[PDB]
């Protein structure tokens, strides 16, 4: 589910000591408690990856965390100031923040993987038309990892559903497999970070 870019000007820089140090600033709009929630979510990367989110000093490439419309991030390192939105009303949860930070690392939604049609059916007629593009298949760098229903990057079955009970995504051949967890990073989520950023 990683974006395909050969240059890695596209990705965060790895230091000679192996750490991928990603500078950030958090909008003054957030209270101290909200800052702590964001930084808490960032710590989830420390135990099992070489990713380190650190407060910016004066680095050129950095993440600016802002409370805008919904929860979103740019994909990968964009160069200079790049925004990541954690709306104060709907996004201040560890798993959601981790999901967004994974976008910033270069990871896309699980259901858009190039191999997705072997694991899910997209029920187009059930999807809010303006939001259907979120379900488009992409030419992803899958990093020799398999499709993971339990990925923090997988949409829930009712994501952008027009009406209750008519799901946007149905897992196949077993429709009962859970999708859409936002508790924490899956084994494959962690493995993918480590493969992409060559963490040792
Ligand atoms: Zn997302």
- 3-state percent breakdown (helix, strand, coil) of the chain, nearest 5: 25, 20, 55
Q: Using CA atoms, how far apart are residues 39 and 189, in angstroms rounded to an integer?
A: 19
Domains of the chain: 1-200 (3.40.390.10)
Phi, psi torsion values for 136, nearest 5 degrees:
-65, 135
- Annotated binding-site positions for Zn(2+): 99, 103, 109
Q: What's the CA-to-centroid distance between 17 and ligand 1, angstroms?
A: 30
Q: Using CA atoms, how far apart are residues 126 and 189, in angstroms rounded to an integer?
A: 28
Among residues 117, 124, 113, the alpha carbon closest in space to that of 173 is found at: 117
Q: What's the CA-to-centroid distance between 114 and ligand 1, angstroms?
A: 17
CB–CB of 19/53 below 8 Å?
no
- Choice among 59, 100, 110, 125 that is catalytic: 100
Residue 100 annotated to the active site: yes
Q: What's the CA-to-centroid distance between 16 and ligand 1, angstroms?
A: 30
Strands (E), the chain: 20-26, 51-55, 62-66, 71-73, 81-86, 120-122, 169-171
Among residues 29, 59, 62, 24, the alpha carbon closest in space to that of 43 is found at: 24
- Annotated binding-site positions: 99, 103, 109
Determination technique for this entry: X-ray
Q: What's the CA-to-centroid distance between 72 and ligand 1, angstroms?
A: 6
The resolution of the experimental structure, rounded to one decimal in Å, is 1.3
Query: Residue 176 burial by CB count (10 A; 0-12/13-18/19+): exposed, middle or buried?
Result: exposed
Q: Using CA atoms, how far apart are residues 195 and 192, in angstroms rounded to an integer?
A: 5
């Amino acid at each position: 589910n990683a974006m395909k870019c050969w240059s890695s000007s596209c990705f965060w820089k790895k230091a000679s000591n192996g750490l991928v140090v990603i500078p950030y600033v958090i909008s003054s709009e957030y209270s101290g408690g909200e800052v702590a929630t964001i930084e808490g979510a960032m710590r989830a990367f420390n135990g099992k990856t070489c990713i380190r989110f650190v407060r910016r000093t004066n680095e050129y490439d950095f993440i600016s965390v802002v409370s805008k419309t919904g929860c979103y991030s740019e994909l990968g390192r964009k160069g200079g100031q790049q925004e990541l939105s954690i709306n104060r009303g709907g996004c201040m949860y560890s798993g959601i923040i981790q999901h967004e930070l994974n976008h910033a690392l270069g990871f896309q939604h699980e259901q858009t993987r190039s191999d997705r049609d072997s694991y899910v059916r997209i029920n187009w007629e059930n999807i809010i038309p303006a939001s259907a593009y979120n379900f488009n298949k992409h030419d992803t760098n899958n990093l020799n990892t398999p499709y993971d229903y339990s990925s923090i990057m997988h949409y829930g079955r009712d994501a952008f559903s027009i009406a209750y009970g008519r799901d946007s995504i149905t897992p196949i051949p077993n429709p009962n497999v859970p999708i859409g967890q936002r508790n924490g990073m899956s084994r494959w989520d962690i493995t993918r970070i480590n493969v992409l950023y060559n963490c040792r």
